[PDB]
Design a binder for this molecule. Structure first.
Ligand SMILES: CC(C)(COP(=O)(O)OP(=O)(O)OC[C@H]1O[C@@H](n2cnc3c(N)ncnc32)[C@H](O)[C@@H]1OP(=O)(O)O)[C@@H](O)C(=O)NCCC(=O)NCCS
Length: 197
């Protein structure tokens, strides 16, 4: 069926594409901003590559080694110093997320940049999150942080012991005179969620 793997460098191109496509198709903030995969890859390919290279990311692959679900994780200290391919299309995204960067870890922390699954309702994302919790413990991380934009992942994180430490309401959020997130209907907040290991 599908095999749980630790992502390695040979999967980098597949990992970048998987999250780009998955988020552009199905993640609330990307959809709200009408991002294309070009927009997403430009802004986020660096962090996605680093999620693979730091060694703490996981995926489910099919028999032909295609990624069907993945979780891209990176140490928080690398996240805090991350560079992005900034473009006008994603400026409001960075503005929104920036609000959550005020709650910071006081010890070793693993940051979940992205979780996604193209084969849904089969437990794949849940299993990736549980694997990530095991990984965090094994490497002496004290916290896992995620900025979760989707009610589905918020509930999943809650089910696995995460607590909300910060939030921003989508409806009414402004970037200058624009209201770029008012189109979101599935989810009311973006939330920074923290699990203490
Ligand atoms: C969110 C996402 C990762 C879920 O992955 P998935 O593999 O279906 O999730 P799992 O099957 O492990 O299911 C996890 C839980 O979500 C629930 N769930 C999954 N899809 C759901 C849906 N469309 N509506 C309501 N609940 C849903 C499951 O029922 C399950 O809960 P339970 O076990 O308590 O019943 C997937 O929908 C996705 O990739 N979305 C685009 C990506 C995204 O937005 N990522 C998060 C950004 S924070």
């Amino acid at each position: 069926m599908y095999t749980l793997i630790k992502l390695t460098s040979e999967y980098t191109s597949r990992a970048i594409s998987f999250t780009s496509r998955n988020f552009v198709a199905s993640e609330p903030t990307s959809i709200a901003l009408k991002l294309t995969t070009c927009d997403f890859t430009t802004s986020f390919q660096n962090i996605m590559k680093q999620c693979v290279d730091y060694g703490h990311s996981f995926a489910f692959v099919d028999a032909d080694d295609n990624i069907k679900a993945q979780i891209l994780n990176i140490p928080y200290d690398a996240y805090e110093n991350m560079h992005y391919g900034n473009i006008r299309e994603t400026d409001p995204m960075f503005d929104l997320f920036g609000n959550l960067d005020s709650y910071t870890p006081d010890d070793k922390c693993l940051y979940v940049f992205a979780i996604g699954s193209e084969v849904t309702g089969k437990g794949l994302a849940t299993k990736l999150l549980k694997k990530t919790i095991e990984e965090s413990s094994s490497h002496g991380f004290k916290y896992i942080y995620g900025d979760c934009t989707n009610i589905i992942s918020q509930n999943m994180f809650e089910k696995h012991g995460f607590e909300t430490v910060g939030s921003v309401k989508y409806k009414g959020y402004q970037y200058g005179i624009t209201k770029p997130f008012d189109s979101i209907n599935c989810t009311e907040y973006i939330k920074r969620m923290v699990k203490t290991i």
